[PDB]
Amino acid sequence: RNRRPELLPNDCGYQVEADKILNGDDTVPEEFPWTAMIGYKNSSNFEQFACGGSLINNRYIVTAAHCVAGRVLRVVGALNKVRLGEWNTATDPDCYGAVRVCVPDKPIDLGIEETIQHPDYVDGSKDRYHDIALIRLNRQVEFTNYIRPVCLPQPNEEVQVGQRLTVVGWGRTETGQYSTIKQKLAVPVVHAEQCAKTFGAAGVRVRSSQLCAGGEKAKDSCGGDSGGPLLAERANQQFFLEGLVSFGATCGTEGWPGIYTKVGKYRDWIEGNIRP
Ligand SMILES: *[C@@H]1O[C@H](CO)[C@@H](O)[C@H](O)[C@H]1NC(C)=O
Ligand SMILES: [Ca+2]
Numbered sequence: 001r002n003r004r005p006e007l008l009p010n011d012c013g014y015q016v017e018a019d020k021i022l023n024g025d026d027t028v029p030e031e032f033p034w035t036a037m038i039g040y041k042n043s044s045n046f047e048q049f050a051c052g053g054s055l056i057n058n059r060y061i062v063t064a065a066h067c068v069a070g071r072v073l074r075v076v077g078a079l080n081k082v083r084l085g086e087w088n089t090a091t092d093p094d095c096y097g098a099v100r101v102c103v104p105d106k107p108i109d110l111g112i113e114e115t116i117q118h119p120d121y122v123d124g125s126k127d128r129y130h131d132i133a134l135i136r137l138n139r140q141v142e143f144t145n146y147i148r149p150v151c152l153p154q155p156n157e158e159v160q161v162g163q164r165l166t167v168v169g170w171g172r173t174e175t176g177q178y179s180t181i182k183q184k185l186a187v188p189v190v191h192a193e194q195c196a197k198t199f200g201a202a203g204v205r206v207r208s209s210q211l212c213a214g215g216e217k218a219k220d221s222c223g224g225d226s227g228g229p230l231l232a233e234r235a236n237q238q239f240f241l242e243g244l245v246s247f248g249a250t251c252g253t254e255g256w257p258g259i260y261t262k263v264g265k266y267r268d269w270i271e272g273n274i275r276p
Helices: 071-075 263-272
Strands: 035-041 047-055 060-063 078-084 108-110 112-117 133-137 164-169 183-188 210-213 229-234 238-247 258-262
Touching: 035 060, 047 078, 047 238, 060 238, 078 112, 164 238, 210 238, 238 263, 258 263
Parallel strands: none
Antiparallel strands: 035 047, 035 078, 047 060, 060 133, 078 108, 112 133, 164 183, 164 229, 210 258, 229 238, 238 258
């Protein structure tokens, strides 16, 4: 299967601590430097960012398969670019804090060399089982304080119910707000049964490769992007990509937690589909 585990760097999951003035759910630009924005372009050349993803090394982002096939492609446009190093999409340069500083680096928009959807994913399916895809970027990415790779779990590692994780993004889901500043929201992992309604179709079972997180005690935590990261902070403040958004959480009266692709469960597949 041509697995190349050594192409996933050991220097992963570390971010600069450079924190500052009054927050909210807003991040500083240095937080979660593996976030990516996925950009689309329709037939009259209108562009917009409508999905997220996570930088895993200097050549790849990992996202949901539903971000690279089907509905998004007809509703928004063709897959076009991936943006790294963004913080506030409303501004450029990005400047923050009472004692003011600016991000030295303009966000980078990279082309897509190839997209690899998981072979077992079915576009339009009720369950979206195996909702994962790799995007090989056009260029080797040089890491900075604002662009760095996230760690991936091993296939035998499990998140436990009650464990708190962080979903990060710009509200780029079907029902999201489309925020301009990158947001972080803390969410509990919950029993799979609580995601019964998440599919928006009855009778779908939550598989082992799916994670249910959000819910009744996390009504202030809706955000993230389709394909966007769900993170565990493990020992030594090293962040791991426990999940990516497959069905977004909804935080209203009759809403539901989100279903995430368990990324560790696809570690072998990832390693077999990356090249230097
Ligand atoms: C491209 O998107 C813009 C903005 O949403 C829209 O006005 C336009 O109709 C789209 N192009 C077509 C005709 O597909
Ligand atoms: Ca910006």
